[PDB]
Design a binder for this molecule. Sequence first.
Ligand code: HEM
Ligand code: HEM
Ligand SMILES: [Cl-]
Ligand SMILES: [Cl-]
Ligand code: NA
Ligand code: NA
Lengths: 713, 713
Amino acid sequence: GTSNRDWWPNQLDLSILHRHSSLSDPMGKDFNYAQAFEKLDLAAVKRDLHALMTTSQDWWPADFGHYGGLFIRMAWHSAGTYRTADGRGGAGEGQQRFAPLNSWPDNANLDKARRLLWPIKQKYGRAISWADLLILTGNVALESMGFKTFGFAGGRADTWEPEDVYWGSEKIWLELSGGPNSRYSGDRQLENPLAAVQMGLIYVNPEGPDGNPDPVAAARDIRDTFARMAMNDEETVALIAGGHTFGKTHGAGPASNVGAEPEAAGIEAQGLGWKSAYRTGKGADAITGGLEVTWTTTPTQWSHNFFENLFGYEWELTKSPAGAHQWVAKGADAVIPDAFDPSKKHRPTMLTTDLSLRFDPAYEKISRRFHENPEQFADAFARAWFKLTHRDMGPRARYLGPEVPAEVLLWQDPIPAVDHPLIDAADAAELKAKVLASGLTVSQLVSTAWAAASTFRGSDKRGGANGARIRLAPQKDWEANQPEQLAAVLETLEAIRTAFNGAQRGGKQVSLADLIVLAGCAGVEQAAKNAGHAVTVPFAPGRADASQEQTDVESMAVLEPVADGFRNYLKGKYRVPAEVLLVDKAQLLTLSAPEMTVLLGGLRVLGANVGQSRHGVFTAREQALTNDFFVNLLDMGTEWKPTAADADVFEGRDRATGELKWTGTRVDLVFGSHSQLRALAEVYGSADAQEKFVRDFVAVWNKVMNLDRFDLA
Amino acid sequence: GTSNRDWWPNQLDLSILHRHSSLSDPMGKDFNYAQAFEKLDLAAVKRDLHALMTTSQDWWPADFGHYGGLFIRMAWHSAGTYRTADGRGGAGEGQQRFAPLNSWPDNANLDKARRLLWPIKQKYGRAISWADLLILTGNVALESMGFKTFGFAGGRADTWEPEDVYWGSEKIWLELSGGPNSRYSGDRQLENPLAAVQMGLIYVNPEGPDGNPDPVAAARDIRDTFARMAMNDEETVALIAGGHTFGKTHGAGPASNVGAEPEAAGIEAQGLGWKSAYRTGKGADAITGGLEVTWTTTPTQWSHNFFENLFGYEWELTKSPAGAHQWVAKGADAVIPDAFDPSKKHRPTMLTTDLSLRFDPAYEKISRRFHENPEQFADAFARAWFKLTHRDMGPRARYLGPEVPAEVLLWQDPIPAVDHPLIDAADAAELKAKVLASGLTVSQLVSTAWAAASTFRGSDKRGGANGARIRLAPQKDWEANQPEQLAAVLETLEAIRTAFNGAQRGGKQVSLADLIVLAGCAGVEQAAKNAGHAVTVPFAPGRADASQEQTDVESMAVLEPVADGFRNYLKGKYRVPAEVLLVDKAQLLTLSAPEMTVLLGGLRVLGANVGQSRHGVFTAREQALTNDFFVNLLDMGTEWKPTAADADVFEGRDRATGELKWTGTRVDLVFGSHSQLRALAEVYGSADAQEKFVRDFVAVWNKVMNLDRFDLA
Ligand code: HEM
Ligand code: HEM
Ligand SMILES: [Cl-]
Ligand SMILES: [Cl-]
Ligand code: NA
Ligand code: NA
């Protein structure tokens, strides 16, 4: 059946903005997952998970009698899809159970692990999400095997369909580099936003880069991918050596024995895949990835043996029973236990990527320190594991349950507690009046508040106006934020704040975070007044100001908007058309197509464009909140053509006279071109729509201002 | 960007069930289009439309000074995509303005016609939908030109995205038949549910079948396609001759001058397409389809000149300036006006498909009667035009405004007015008790009510339990409805009804339509009681009973369920997998994925299956309303295999013992296979879900019962 995607494959796709509707969701409108989890008996769940570790099922028998290794792999894969570039992936939505991740080659036999969890999921029902349960299961595995974790937070709500994520352009699973859709170019430069080396891998190829078993060159890939998942050298070494303290790989026979992944398997498979024709197909005969490595002498217990082996032997290249490259210890005794036969023992083995920890000079120093100081390894691995599994969960206000660690970590972008009375409605009226009396313009106020709030992304719940990080490095210097204009606005607002706070009794004070947002509200209100409308914008106080020492400058860099169509801004020249980047930003902000449409048409006429560009400012009353953008964009009296100078800029001329009326970019004109967007634009451009436009504007403005307000959730 | 549809192109697609969410809709959640339209000043709209017919715009100048013919073409294409097989297409949702219809080749230059309407759309805003406005424009065109229409109903609410419709499998616009995705097979048999001869056409090829200009063979295609749009011979003649009383075709130059269709055009085109390089590109030089025919001597006035010409001249084959086949009267004087040059005149011309009206023997008899009696032609054309443009609008209760025709037409599946007091809650409770005391079983009651209600389809809003047409031909004999069991149930219900109605005073009586639905309610309540839960199923009286004389038997045939996965029924053996047919039927019933999932799992354990098949009845307490379907489907203790006898039937056996527990079909097992459906099944199969299952089941059951109750809107 031919579809629109077939006829027009480079059309903009808006269905990404309408995923996650109440239509697809089985829970009712009012279901609140946080409230459900807070009443779960987490201790009971954890007891059942401990029991499960050693209750082997015959359709997927436990290695060594203990599922712990399988489940730690499951949890690290759940978290391991995370990319800091866009915040997409990670464990926070339980996407491992949906396509494509449920069928990625690197997730082979994790369908078994998830099915082993069904009886527990079933018992506790809606009070524990699959997303939380995957991570909890990983923690319990660690604990069952003697490793004390740093803590755990619940609160990851389940989702009900696949997320739309760009995972690459390759059309072949696991395709090696330099193909027609290569993710690499140059000197092994991985394309953003990707964070894996091959399609359907978590991070790197365990045999080495493109299958070449060079540990030193493998280390370069590990360092780049892990960096792209927000982990530094110490965290990377602690996580790989920690993980590979446990369990084994599965490569007992040729991979051509393994059949269809879950989304390709027959209906009778009931959700499972990778059925193997090799011997019994499971257990001692299991085939997962093709390697056959067991790292330690006690694969079901925490030990210091990973580093003892890594350093204690010299390594020789060999092949697994499936033919993959791997390493064996020269001259060693058979000291490693077999997973099923108590009469068999094996020589120590390693992956190419494990040897990276010893042969990359920077990793070697870390691995040596951990080898010599195993308590330092244990503590780093606990911290790193918590970071791994919580990195996309958002502000600490979202963390639920009795095991949340009290220590505040830099990577959480922490926001100080509020310890004083908050401003009330009378005070907010007085501050808005002082803001309007200072001489700050509509355009300044709206631009500043937009810049502060619009860093939010829903993918990992980072960013937003809480913290007043707009005043700190690096946000205060970002090009999109108009550093010199921003500094003059912050200077005026900080003087207003100091004067208000100095006049208070009791401990009452306003944060600069709240004042930035309240000042934006005042700008909106004034813009409405300019247009003849009486509008109050809602404002919720309670934001606090973070310090520079609570603000990791390097980790903040991934939030910089290099494309922000809501400010008609594009930092350079990209492969992806600007309208596509607009819809991607709308998705990170959590906006639907109508909300993206209303919001952009309002921002244009309010003067939010970077550099005060006239592109898209289709009004003769700038700084007044009207639906002029829409009425004028849709006027068929105006004809549009791309300029000679720049094909991505357009001139709108009176079709009868030839006179120049407007200029616009592709972000602007897409609202008059794309058939779905133009239908939205027409609702807002109609003669009955001025009041609807204003109201809908204020609503979406307020939404954006509150996107990080998990303290109010 | 590789997607799930790329990796797994044959997986089931659920997103068709979640189109039309509150997310995509710009109007607020409480917007009610009927309330808006009822206050429209319809007469004012019509006066603006009248004016517009003769106000030419320079960017698409009006032929003959009058846009009438273009707008009649626009409205017939809006209505003309309708297929009786599934009720999809038609004018009822204004889908011409979205992809792919906005860019079909047969809709070329209709983008201009819709743009000419924007000033009026804009003026009246939400009080007149696009959907309504396309049809109303065509009525006003007819009226402006001297033709008395049969009336007009508003009430078509706008939609905000493309509907998912199967339009064919060809990958080339306008592909001739016999290709690798041919829609024809056998002796020119067009595949169901299609109703056009080539991809991107409305019905037929105006040059003849696959371009062969044989009027006689073109008549066979006309007859078949029109029949598939629900129009018989008299209606088809009246409509083609009617339409071609007006206007002209456009073929001033070679078609290679025409550029990209709207969805492929540049952003500067602002939603328009088919930009032409031939001379001025428009007006006298217009190119639309490539033919150059003007049928009558007065193209802007109703006449009987189409048939005067068709019969009054002998025709000869010739070629337009773009090279398409068409017909000329060479014997004639130059009597037809030129569209732009008052000093030019032309000979009469016809399409091959117009000559079909004279050279197919059955059409000729009709055309002759219309020729000789043009008042009969006018009346037939008015009735057919109303039918054309209203055929997918649903029950007369949805018709809005001051121009609705009072005559009730058989094609409307009419429902008699109710002139008597309705039963109240106490009466409904006494009827439910009498139905349960009669001895009718939960299975019989549920099966009957399901069979009566589940004929509904949202595509054209035909079907449903209103009317009690389950007791009439043909519904009473459909195999899915189990005609002998159905007759025994209806006989018992009719005796209950006669007894209750005979005992009333004051005119109070219950219809059989309402009693069938209330009896289904009693069955569901009793099933809940059997499981130990006291529930009340909501019930809304006011249905009426239609007579056999008010029921077109032949038109009802397209509503027969030949696949109904909710009753595990498949009438024969199809090319499309049964699970795909299930999602199709869900979409026609307007169900989301969660509602489809709850409903099917409840129906299974209530005994709704056709034939009392055990397939999917995964319970040991049949006729009790429990979540057993889901608990037992999801039990990993059971292993599934396709039977030797039938690959579409599966045995569920205890995995340890091999004992046979259950059998199921693909419709059953897809809920255990598809990763999104299995996530839904899990919610209902969890230990905390009994209450939720029952509530959600009653809610969807009630929804289904009420699908056709537009009298309560
Ligand atoms: C460079 C990064 C990594 C590479 C290339 C890698 C590679 C692999 C491979 C190839 C397997 C075998 C799969 C099979 O055939 O069953 C696996 C198993 C496993 N890995 Fe990793 N790994 C990485 C990082 C991690 C991390 C960060 C952790 C956790 C903190 C982890 C914990 C595990 C565990 C516990 C297993 C054993 C599974 C079992 O016993 O079934 N690994 N690893
Ligand atoms: C066998 C069915 C039909 C065929 C093959 C068909 C064919 C066509 C074609 C090829 C054109 C020329 C398009 C262009 O180049 O501008 C057209 C024009 C038109 N058709 Fe039809 N037609 C069909 C039925 C109908 C019906 C049912 C109606 C309305 C009741 C209709 C009303 C019109 C009108 C008014 C025009 C003139 C457009 C203008 O003046 O711009 N036709 N027809
Ligand atoms: Cl994601
Ligand atoms: Cl449709
Ligand atoms: Na994420
Ligand atoms: Na329809």
